[PDB]
Subunit: 167 residues, 2 copies
């Protein structure tokens, strides 16, 4: 298992975040219209997965705002904002701020994504929520970057996520 921190206090996260050079595991998540979305639906594109505990807490919103803007600066990529929030909470946020580039996806019917992607908080009050994480996937569904954010109350390293998409 893995360990992240909340203001220094350890939090247990199941399994292992995918490693660069490994195959991305397929998933099914739920979109704003309650349709089911799979990894294969993005065939041929790069994918940025911005994973977080809740849009309604902490730095998660800040990260959505940032990735929404960054989405405009890269080509042939989808930016997926993924959490255990119901689709309605995710879309409430994006709608209030007019954040139209990111695609919001919910794990509320698909807890197995959190296990497969090594982001399931396993124990404690945050149990059932995703840890803060970024995974970047290439056009051939190979993982080319991941970060399991060590301090959950800090934003992910946007630069590092974007660097693997540059020439």
């Amino acid at each position: 298992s893995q360990t992240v921190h909340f203001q220094g206090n350890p939090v247990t996260v199941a399994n292992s975040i995918p490693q660069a050079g490994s195959k991305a595991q397929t998933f099914t998540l739920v979109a704003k219209d309650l349709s089911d979305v799979t990894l294969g639906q993005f065939a041929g594109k790069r994918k940025v997965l911005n994973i977080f505990p809740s849009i309604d807490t902490g730095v998660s919103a800040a990260s959505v705002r940032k990735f929404n803007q960054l989405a405009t600066e890269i080509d042939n990529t989808v930016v997926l904002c993924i959490s255990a929030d119901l689709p309605f909470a995710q879309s409430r946020f994006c709608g209030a701020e007019g954040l139209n580039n990111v695609i919001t996806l919910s794990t509320f019917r698909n807890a197995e994504f959190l296990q497969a992607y090594g982001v399931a908080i396993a124990d404690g009050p945050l149990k059932g929520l995703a840890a803060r994480a970024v995974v970047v996937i290439d056009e051939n569904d190979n993982v080319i970057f991941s970060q399991l954010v060590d301090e959950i109350t800090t934003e992910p390293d946007y630069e590092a996520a974007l660097a693997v998409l540059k020439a």
Copy 2:
């Protein structure tokens, strides 16, 4: 199973809502502070369970506002607002409106409550969400009222829920 409707279109709901005169099944749900709450923690009180698909959609908020006010007019009762929303969405709503009488509880780690209470939407886009329902439980954990709302876009019958608590 049971059938409710969304603008007349049928929606399948698992099992059977508890019937008046039957024992209330125990549950564990998650509160605003991410602590786990059980039915036994309300020993000796009457319980009103206001169950709904999401606080962020439809008539659900209207029902929270109403039950928050009604909570002030009855004695020895807790009013529990229950959904698959994360605790954060529920508390966001209550906080914005200063609705301090209801107790918000989430099924996000406890999908078995939806099955046990015959409120799990089984199929279709709403799968994974609770149907709109009210269950009232007495001081001895006997069910004294339930309503599985036939048209999910209409509010529950507040009067009927409250009538079983009167002399």
